[PDB]
């Protein structure tokens, strides 16, 4: 169950994961495999489909809450690039993964983008921010964001009725015409209304199959395993506190439920927003 | 200012227009021209952009409230046909217009579709159901629905910062690449996920300019002027009841002032969400 603190539609808003009424880390404490290494990952949904507000696991605060992305100190919203409305999937990340920046991909020749690997989930259900979902991985797209390799995993909720008809990236392309091209278009153009340039892609923008996806996810899992695993090096700024439970792995960074002594501002519903949550932008 | 009655997300929900705390007809009592005849119309927004619930002016009830469209005794929702999410404009109608079914268009050769003329408003502000906004028509598209000519006027809110840059249908096209094609695509496919077929279009799907649009709009206004002004003729279950005067400053069908049983049910919020508000369809 998720839990809220601070003031909504503000920078003080925070969403924390709990188990048994005990706060755990969104980043570290949710296992990557929902169910063995047979086709089943945990996803942290950060951004509900057809919403605009940039939400993310924070990495830099205790228990790693989901919060509003902020810089130029105002809440950040993505644009609507025609014909898309905000995010065209449930967007989020895989827990216990880390695109370690000190590692360069042998294909893009670019560093890791320093976050848990991103996921676009393509099912029917619109998933609320903060949901933890069993997903099936179908493929990856490699976006090169501003000098970095920024992987985008393509997945589907396993309870979704389409999940059993889709077992690889080519199946997606057959049942959802126009969709993969829409997905690359989305990442190509999403920062152009901000004045920034189009993004480019790994493999000349080719979507790779699930077998490849799993190899990338596995490497990002190993980087996370290194970050967390008693690995006594100041990779900090990032916060590695965990209360779980593999295999903490008896983390050098594991602790009590000091987490619980999190008393912060209390949830308070707040004012609604203005920017270009409504506005259309036309970049072919 | 609009007002609500009945229970939200149910078939008893009604939204009525009022002026001076006095109810008036959405259909008849709102003047078609917001401000003289230099391209400024009143629009009744029925359906906000990026929503799914089919809302319409009811022609068959007193004061003509906006209601949920219901069919197969359930609330009706349009689908999300990829890549679109619900309606891709503020969708609605022009008041004091009527596509009289007893008139056949010389071009489509199909009957009028028996409703006020429809409008897609393309501005950036998302307008709530029930809003009355001043718009500028930029052009028109003729869909031929199930044997009928169903006109779709293209317009923009005159307060929208883009309005002074868009003066005709080709301006729209140059500032909003892909948009007109999307609009025809939307109307082509929007009932295919319901098992029904694709719709086809007048003029091989060509969007016509504003000069043509205004001629269509005015003939639908004449039809309405006919339905209303006098014509002591039965209108099929359509309720011609007016206040206003304004002008209908005496329709045979004018009265005033009702206000009286505007008294149906008190507004009451209910459970949201039923159908395929969420699901993507690939056609």
How would you sum up this structure, described in words?
By secondary structure, chain A is α+β, with helices and mostly antiparallel strands. Chain A has one domain: Inorganic pyrophosphatase (Inorganic Pyrophosphatase, Alpha-Beta Complex). Helix content of chain A is 13%, strand content 23%. The first copy, chain A, has 3 helices and 14 strands. The first copy, chain A, has helices at 169-175, 179-189, 210-228, and strands at residues 2-5, 14-19, 22-24, 41-47, 55-57, 66-68, 80-81, 90-93, 111-112, 118-121, 132-145, 148-157, 200-201, 280-281. In chain A, strands 4-8-10-12-11 form a 5-stranded mixed barrel. In chain A, a hairpin with an 8-residue loop joins β1 (2-5) and β2 (14-19). In chain A, 39% of the residues are buried. The A-B interface holds A 50, 82-85, 88, 124-126, 175-179, 182, 276, 278-280, 282, 284 and B 49-50, 82-85, 88, 124-126, 175-179, 182, 278-280, 282.
